[PDB]
Amino acid sequence: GRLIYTAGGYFRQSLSYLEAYNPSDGTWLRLADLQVPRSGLAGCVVGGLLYAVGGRNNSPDGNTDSSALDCYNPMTNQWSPCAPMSVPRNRIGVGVIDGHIYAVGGSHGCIHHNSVERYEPERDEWHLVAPMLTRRIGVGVAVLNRLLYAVGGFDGTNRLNSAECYYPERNEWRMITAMNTIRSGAGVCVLHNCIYAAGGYDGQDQLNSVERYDVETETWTFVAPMKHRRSALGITVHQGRIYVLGGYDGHTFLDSVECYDPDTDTWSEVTRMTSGRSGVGVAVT
Ligand SMILES: CCn1nnc2c(C)c([C@@H](CC(=O)O)c3cc(C)c4c(c3)CN(C(=O)c3ccccc3)CC4)ccc21
Numbered sequence: 001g002r003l004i005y006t007a008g009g010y011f012r013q014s015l016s017y018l019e020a021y022n023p024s025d026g027t028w029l030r031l032a033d034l035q036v037p038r039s040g041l042a043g044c045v046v047g048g049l050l051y052a053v054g055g056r057n058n059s060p061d062g063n064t065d066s067s068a069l070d071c072y073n074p075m076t077n078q079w080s081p082c083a084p085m086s087v088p089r090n091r092i093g094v095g096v097i098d099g100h101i102y103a104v105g106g107s108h109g110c111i112h113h114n115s116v117e118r119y120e121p122e123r124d125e126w127h128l129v130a131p132m133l134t135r136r137i138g139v140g141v142a143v144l145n146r147l148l149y150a151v152g153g154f155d156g157t158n159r160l161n162s163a164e165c166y167y168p169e170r171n172e173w174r175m176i177t178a179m180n181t182i183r184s185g186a187g188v189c190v191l192h193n194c195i196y197a198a199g200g201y202d203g204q205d206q207l208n209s210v211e212r213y214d215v216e217t218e219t220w221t222f223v224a225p226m227k228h229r230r231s232a233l234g235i236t237v238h239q240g241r242i243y244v245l246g247g248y249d250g251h252t253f254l255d256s257v258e259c260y261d262p263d264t265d266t267w268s269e270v271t272r273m274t275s276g277r278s279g280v281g282v283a284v285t
């Protein structure tokens with residue numbers, strides 16, 4: 001069975017946890033620790049392997065934004081380092097197209113990147129591609145029909161309702177329809193020809209609203225809100241349902257996991273993580 005993996009995150013410090021949840025029976029497994037605890041990273045899968053990308057580490061000697069790429073093999077339960085990105089990218093978004101990892105935005109200190117770079121596993125090589133139109137940290141990324149979408153985030157001054165799409169065959173970005181809501185640190189994923197944006201932070205509060213972009217109509221419409229407001233949450237899709245994991249609600253680091261059913265337009269709470277955390281990377285394989 002496929003498992004939902006959560007890597008790293010934040011709870012009083014950057015975290016090294018790697019854990020996997022099995023939807024078939026509701027159980028959690030603890031797996032090999034990340035070599036370097038990191039919050040604000042992103043996860044993805046290529047070839048059955050989990051990659052942990054970017055983020056930020058806390059150490060007694062100081063806090064550091066990360067250019068790291070590390071790969072986890074579920075069959076050996078081992079992490080291995082990969083080539084680093086061109087720049088540190090904390091509060092990064094990532095998506096996969098044609099077995100290549102795209103690292104989007106994020107920050108390095110005061111620098112809010114608009115740059116984007118692409119990793120080819122077979123060559124362990126990163127190279128820059130065309131930059132986004134907007135600098136975006138805390139950006140949510142998903143892939144649909146071999147196009148890469150960058151949704152929301154923070155540009156250094158404003159949290160954003162804008163979104164843009166990258167066309168790999170043209171090496172160009174173009175804006176898409178803006179969301180109804182300003183969101184940084186939203187959960188962004190793809191289900192049945194729509195891009196969902198769940199929760200996030202607007203500069204004032206963490207959100208429970210959820211909206212989705214239908215790729216045919218190019219329109220964003222609200223669906224049912226999550227039971228718990230949350231920003232900096234993990235998200236993925238498994239067997240036709242969205243799972244949101246953890247995050248921050250302004251008062252606590254959440255352990256809640258909710259699952260959205262599009263046919264009934266309902267969220268339900270399905271499990272709790274073994275401890276509350278925000279800023280995780282999540283993927284399924
Ligand atoms: C700008 C770059 N960046 N990226 N990520 C950043 C993070 C994770 C922080 C940290 C601090 C740091 O590691 O330095 C951070 C950020 C916030 C917003 C809070 C806490 C810690 C610690 N909190 C608590 O325990 C808490 C929360 C609720 C109730 C009780 C305790 C308070 C909220 C700062 C800067 C970062």
Ligand SMILES: CCn1nnc2c(C)c([C@@H](CC(=O)O)c3cc(C)c4c(c3)CN(C(=O)c3ccccc3)CC4)ccc21
Pocket residue numbers: 009010039040041091092137138139153154159184185200201206231232248250278279280
């Ligand atoms: C404090 C008010 N607040 N609430 N939620 C907040 C969020 C989403 C942000 C954005 C950045 C922004 O809009 O500038 C943001 C976006 C992401 C993806 C991450 C963090 C921060 C920092 N990371 C954390 O684990 C984290 C998040 C919140 C609290 C503690 C740790 C890592 C990941 C800022 C500020 C916010």
